Amino acid sequence: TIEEQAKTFLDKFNHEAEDLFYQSSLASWNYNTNITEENVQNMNNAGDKWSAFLKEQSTLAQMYPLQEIQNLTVKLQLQALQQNGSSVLSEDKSKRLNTILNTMSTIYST
Amino acid sequence: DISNSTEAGQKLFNMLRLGKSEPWTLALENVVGAKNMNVRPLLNYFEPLFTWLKDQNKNSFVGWSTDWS
Amino acid sequence: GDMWGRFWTNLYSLTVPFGQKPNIDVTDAMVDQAWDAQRIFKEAEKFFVSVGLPNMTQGFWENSMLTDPGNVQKAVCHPTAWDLGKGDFRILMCTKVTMDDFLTAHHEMGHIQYDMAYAAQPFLLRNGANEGFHEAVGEIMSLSAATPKHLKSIGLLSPDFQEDNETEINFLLKQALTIVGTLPFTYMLEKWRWMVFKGEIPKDQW
Ligand SMILES: *[C@@H]1O[C@H](CO)[C@@H](O[C@@H]2O[C@H](CO)[C@@H](O)[C@H](O)[C@H]2NC(C)=O)[C@H](O)[C@H]1NC(C)=O
Ligand SMILES: *[C@@H]1O[C@H](CO)[C@@H](O[C@@H]2O[C@H](CO)[C@@H](O)[C@H](O)[C@H]2NC(C)=O)[C@H](O)[C@H]1NC(C)=O
Ligand SMILES: *[C@@H]1O[C@H](CO)[C@@H](O[C@@H]2O[C@H](CO)[C@@H](O)[C@H](O)[C@H]2NC(C)=O)[C@H](O)[C@H]1NC(C)=O
Ligand SMILES: *[C@@H]1O[C@H](CO)[C@@H](O[C@@H]2O[C@H](CO)[C@@H](O)[C@H](O)[C@H]2NC(C)=O)[C@H](O)[C@H]1NC(C)=O
Ligand SMILES: *[C@@H]1O[C@H](CO)[C@@H](O[C@@H]2O[C@H](CO)[C@@H](O)[C@H](O)[C@H]2NC(C)=O)[C@H](O)[C@H]1NC(C)=O
Ligand SMILES: *[C@@H]1O[C@H](CO)[C@@H](O)[C@H](O)[C@H]1NC(C)=O
Ligand SMILES: [Zn+2]
Secondary structure (H helix, E strand, C coil): CHHHHHHHHHHHHHHHHHHHHHHHHHHHHHHHHCCCHHHHHHHHHHHHHHHHHHHHHHHHCCCCCCCCCCCHHHHHHHHHHCCCHHHHCCCHHHHHHHHHHHHHHHHHHC | CCCCCCHHHHHHHHHHCCCCCCCHHHHHHCCCCCCCCCCHHHHHHCHHHHHHHHHHCCCCCCCCCCCCC | CCCCCCCCHHHHHHHCCCCCCCCCCCHHHHHCCCCCCCHHHHHHHHHHHHHCCCCCCHHHHHCCECCCCCCCCCCCCCCEEEEEECCEEEEECCCCCCCHHHHHHHHHHHHHHHHCCCCCCCHHHCCCCCCCCCHHHHHHHHHCCCCHHHHHHHCCCCCCCCCCCCHHHHHHHHHHCCCHHHHHHHHHHHHHHHHHCCCCCCCCCC
């Protein structure tokens, strides 16, 4: 029933994904339309609150192995979470990387 | 200009409402009939300019030498 | 033209084929008919509905930024579309009654008409079929609204107006400076990066 599992899991994921995504996008809408420092922090709050949900759900989804699913429309969503991203790095390295990326952008900007 | 032409809306509305639920090659085919990026239609667009240019560059050297500096 | 050579657009003034025949602009026939930043986004919607795609939604007309506030209330005026989810969409752009904004209106309603179509898919299946599909629909929307056969119909471009085969070259060359002129640059720049990332270029020959 591995497939059924992978399914029920997605069903549960969808709702929360949607609602947190709303609350995260509305924030940036209000920020960009109404530039006000009283908005920046609210936007960041909703934003990283959503972003954390993704890490949680992804690591929660490494269980279901790919090569059993044939209902390709769920094999397609699962592939989109299981991406380990840059978290696969160590920690010293992974925070050296972000420092490099932030330095290269500031130089160009200023 | 595709306006006022409903049968040009179908050929488009069938590719849109797939999002990412299908391979992009199957989506392409639902509009164009092929499965790969093609450079022929980009050359039909600039045809009346290609003719005019081939006529304007009679007395010039089409190309370049990679040593002058 | 510019700092890197991505687009050759700014070389237009030096290479216009027929400098005398002026381009087609309607920035002026628009003000004479009192065209505000709502007549525009109604013309766009009418264009799309004429093709067969559906109307806009109420929440689109209510909570949009179809014109800059300009008072103490500030914003960031880079035009864009928003798909906040749950079934509301909205455009944010500070539109000046012009022509280049009469095109960006169609460009952005293009994205919005894309999003409204696949909003019946599971949350992770909401995107273009790949990365290059999304902005390639906005383009063909704006590409087909700048044609005199259409301006001459929506009301601008007074009817007895013949286009001559020299304005057409004036137009196609202005395009080729932006479309074709940037293809070798894009290809060369990605070739270089693809080769650098696989060690096929030692670190002393970059
Ligand atoms: C832009 O944002 C400010 C706050 O960042 C909004 O100010 C609020 O206005 C409402 C009434 O409209 C008050 O009840 C709140 O107390 C205000 N908040 C603060 C922090 O002063 C302002 O209304 C926003 N502008 C728009 C057009 O929505
Ligand atoms: C893959 O699984 C999904 C279930 O998540 C199937 O989609 C369901 O299909 C039935 C029958 O058409 C509908 O009644 C359901 O409403 C669908 N699910 C949802 C969430 O709408 C899908 O059909 C399966 N794949 C295949 C090829 O059958
Ligand atoms: C994603 O990263 C994990 C490492 O955190 C990879 O390794 C698996 O980790 C899980 C724990 O979450 C273990 O139960 C598995 O045994 C690990 N794999 C193996 C082969 O032992 C995981 O493989 C990575 N997945 C993808 C798709 O990149
Ligand atoms: C699309 O078709 C409609 C109707 O076939 C056109 O509307 C007509 O336009 C002409 C000239 O602008 C007018 O004389 C008619 O009175 C219009 N009829 C209606 C019912 O509005 C429209 O112009 C067409 N659009 C394009 C771009 O060709
Ligand atoms: C636009 O079309 C006209 C006629 O269709 C072209 O004018 C003629 O072009 C031929 C081709 O060499 C000449 O032999 C004739 O002398 C031209 N006629 C006149 C009255 O000058 C014209 O060349 C075309 N323009 C462009 C840019 O293609
Ligand atoms: C689009 O909206 C207009 C409102 O002006 C309405 O009259 C028209 O019927 C709508 N189009 C369709 C296809 O329902
Ligand atoms: Zn766009």
